Amino acid sequence: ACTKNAIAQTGFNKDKYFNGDVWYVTDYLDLEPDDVPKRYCAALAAGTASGKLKEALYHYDPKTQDTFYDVSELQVESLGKYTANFKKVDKNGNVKVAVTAGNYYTFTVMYADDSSALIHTCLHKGNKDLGDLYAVLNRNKDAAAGDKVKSAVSAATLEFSKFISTKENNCAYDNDSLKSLLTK
Ligand code: HEM
Ligand SMILES: O=N[O-]
Ligand SMILES: O=N[O-]
């Protein structure tokens, strides 16, 4: 179960973050890791489409090859804090699992600038028991975390050395699909 009420960035710039571009997860901190963790790569695009805030997600396990995409409409709870109902889709946006009430994540942008961000998410999926996940994002997929986002990790009272890097996974990403999914 999740335990954190993450605080959104003061002065969060929604239009800059939700600009239609891709964010790559470069490091993450799962507060309830499995006995045996599945080391996934992940990326998202976040944008507005025809007036609706949207996110498209990509997950890829470079060992098992499990790969899935999702599209969500976000609903605003406060500045920088959203509730997202997801539908699983193929890369083209065709629906594989429809939206349903128990399947949603919260998302909070704790820090962002033009190139980097720190987010919190709490995933709810059916009768699964899932915990908090923090992620460091970058606009460039293998960028090492710079000083601004690492300071934000500290200011959240987290220890960056606890985070797991995705940078030495042989991660590959379909960034064109993520962009086009925003409309689906
Ligand atoms: C590298 C960081 C991440 C890792 C290691 C990771 C890992 C996973 C795993 C293992 C699952 C499968 C859960 C299950 O069904 O048992 C999953 C599902 C999911 N994750 Fe992540 N995740 C990451 C980042 C994210 C982010 C940043 C978001 C939100 C923006 C997110 C949203 C979701 C959603 C919505 C599902 C369910 C999708 C579906 O069933 O259609 N994940 N994640
Ligand atoms: O990756 N199985 O939807
Ligand atoms: O673990 N992905 O929310």
Side-chain angles (χ1 to χ4, degrees):
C2 297
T3 64
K4 305 295 171 159
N5 180 0
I7 298 313
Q9 189 186 22
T10 300
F12 178 63
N13 186 335
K14 66 178 182 194
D15 290 343
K16 188 167 164 180
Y17 185 87
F18 292 101
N19 69 344
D21 197 13
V22 168
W23 290 107
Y24 301 95
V25 178
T26 62
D27 304 85
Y28 64 92
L29 178 69
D30 177 353
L31 293 188
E32 235 146 42
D34 292 353
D35 293 66
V36 182
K38 293 148 91 188
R39 302 289 184 204
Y40 283 76
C41 304
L44 56 89
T48 291
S50 297
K52 315 303 161 273
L53 287 170
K54 300 281 294 289
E55 282 193 333
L57 309 177
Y58 167 84
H59 285 73
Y60 172 59
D61 177 331
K63 289 194 157 87
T64 66
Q65 316 304 304
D66 186 51
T67 306
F68 55 92
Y69 291 87
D70 292 86
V71 173
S72 309
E73 289 186 307
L74 272 54
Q75 297 308 141
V76 180
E77 305 306 340
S78 56
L79 183 65
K81 285 179 73 78
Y82 308 95
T83 299
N85 282 309
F86 54 91
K87 49 182 187 199
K88 183 176 280 187
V89 294
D90 63 22
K91 69 189 316 167
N92 313 294
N94 308 298
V95 183
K96 296 185 74 176
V97 181
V99 158
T100 191
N103 279 10
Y104 66 98
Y105 58 102
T106 67
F107 189 81
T108 300
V109 182
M110 298 165 62
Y111 172 78
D113 59 30
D114 74 316
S115 60
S116 64
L118 172 61
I119 67 88
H120 167 275
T121 192
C122 177
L123 178 61
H124 303 258
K125 180 176 170 174
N127 58 5
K128 300 182 190 282
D129 184 39
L130 300 159
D132 302 82
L133 173 72
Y134 295 95
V136 172
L137 311 181
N138 203 277
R139 291 299 190 186
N140 182 295
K141 86 183 164 73
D142 322 275
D147 293 348
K148 295 177 185 192
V149 73
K150 281 194 295 183
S151 291
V153 169
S154 183
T157 314
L158 300 173
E159 175 45 58
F160 188 60
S161 70
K162 304 300 182 188
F163 280 63
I164 295 303
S165 179
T166 58
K167 299 166 280 114
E168 306 76 351
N169 302 334
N170 280 175
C171 298
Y173 303 89
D174 174 17
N175 42 306
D176 300 291
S177 293
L178 276 174
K179 292 200 175 173
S180 59
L181 284 175
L182 285 179
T183 69
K184 298 300 183 162

